[PDB]
Subunit: 289 residues, 2 copies
């Protein structure tokens, strides 16, 4: 058989195929002194196709161990779709045709991530595959919420009794919920009306949502800070916002996306970046499969 | 007329009699040409606009000793028509001639333990969120019964590429097909590996499977497992999670919201008194 080398592993091409045949059909590898040269991904990819075999029996697992299952699958999937993939510095690049090479980053639940990674994102997508072999691709986009409600500045006193906060019965129609002439308020509502918009980061973002015409209600039931209504007659909040801790793990972000998705909502992650409240929407992609 | 509650004096409205109140709102009682009401009952009527306070700091003090959560629980049941007795946050009530019922007010940040869900003879759990929304729960110890033919299994496990894999001819539902191999979860690897005591969650996994259920990741739902009871269910009836330390109440609330959301029943598992036991937590809607 003809052969090649991956890193430092020798492989033979099966069924008497030519090296140019492999290059022609799978579009990977280049010739070099009678040896077909492939990177780990390409190597594992061809092996799984039953097209190559390794001289050394321990070469398969070594490649897989070094190349990871998570990254390998991201590669395999892309290839088995049509794109041409090329890895470099933790990222995977792929172009559907002779066009723009989209960027992709495999994320693991234990992986750490800051809001800044979502803003200065030279990465177009995020890939994930769960403990069941189920892959998922998310896209990152900044949103700029555009509420439609008629907003007014609200400045009022907050009464604290029974372990909860209250406002007057004639506050902006949507703030808090009516209670015997009073207005039961959430902590964020209490901080917002009493003009304490900087009590924290959630209070600043809370204030910003309202400042831009959004009806903001608690999202604590869903694991997020609040659920946002872009309209007064929008029976269901179209957004779920969660204020992002300077640092956290990827599963919290992946989970927020599923939670939001199970109730037809968009998972939004907000923060104070470079002295401003900015929002980033994470949504699963269905056109990359 | 006169009356005292929590040491605070109150007068009836619209010149009504101390006995008019009793007859209508069926609360409190006469003592000596004076009406006696407990805190909850006093506030209940106050908001009804049927009584007033001699003082002016009584209401607030009254609403402070009685909490908001507990009052709402009381007010709701009272409006439902039930008879209510609000002890220490522990509410007893009955609708007409039916048997009495327990009701514990649970705060979203309360510390809940599995041992509680089992031992507690309380009938229902009450919660009123930060938006005034009340929700009732009921826990029932359950014993999962699946119709799946179970077969012992102890095959070797290969560990590469960061994951665990098994032979491509293992029980059809275990793991996931992957180029002839079978991608497994950490729980499946321990199962076929014979390490059922790896952790508490591995023991319930094993118990679950031992009782004919086809177990899979609850991952998508923020839960340990997804459990199918039939030989070929399209959707797992149950959602099962093993309760940690460290376990606040909002976790359960979230879990029930999640389960309901997808047609499933939220179940919490644990090794109690050296045995894997399960408890289903549901939202109750035929009350309030």
């Amino acid at each position: 058989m003809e052969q090649g080398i991956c890193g430092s592993h020798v492989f033979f091409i099966e069924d008497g195929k030519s090296k140019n045949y492999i290059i022609g059909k799978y579009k990977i590898g280049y010739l070099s002194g009678d040896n077909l040269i492939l990177d780990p991904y390409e190597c594992l990819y061809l092996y799984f196709k039953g097209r190559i075999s390794f001289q050394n029996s321990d070469s398969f697992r070594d490649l897989f161990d070094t190349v990871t299952f998570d990254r390998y699958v991201a590669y395999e999937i892309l290839k088995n779709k049509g794109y041409r993939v090329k890895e470099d510095s933790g990222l995977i690049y792929f172009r559907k045709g002779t066009e723009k090479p989209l960027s992709l980053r495999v994320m693991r639940e234990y992986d750490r991530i800051q809001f800044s990674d979502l803003v200065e994102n030279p990465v177009d997508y995020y890939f994930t595959v769960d403990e069941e072999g189920d892959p998922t691709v998310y896209s990152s986009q900044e949103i700029f919420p555009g509420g439609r409600n008629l907003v007014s500045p609200v400045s009022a006193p907050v009464v604290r009794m029974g372990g909860r906060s209250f406002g007057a019965g004639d506050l902006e129609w949507w703030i808090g919920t009516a209670f015997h002439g009073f207005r039961l308020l959430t902590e964020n509502e209490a901080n917002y009306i009493s003009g304490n918009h900087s009590a924290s980061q959630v209070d600043m973002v809370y204030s910003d949502l309202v400042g831009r015409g959004c009806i903001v209600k608690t999202g604590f039931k869903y694991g997020a800070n609040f659920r946002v209504y872009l309209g007064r007659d929008s029976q269901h909040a179209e957004y779920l916002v969660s204020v992002m801790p300077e640092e956290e793990r990827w599963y919290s972000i992946s989970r927020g996306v599923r939670v939001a998705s199970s109730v037809r909502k968009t998972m939004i992650y907000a923060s104070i970046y470079k002295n401003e409240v900015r929002y980033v929407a994470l949504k699963r992609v269905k056109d990359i499969i």
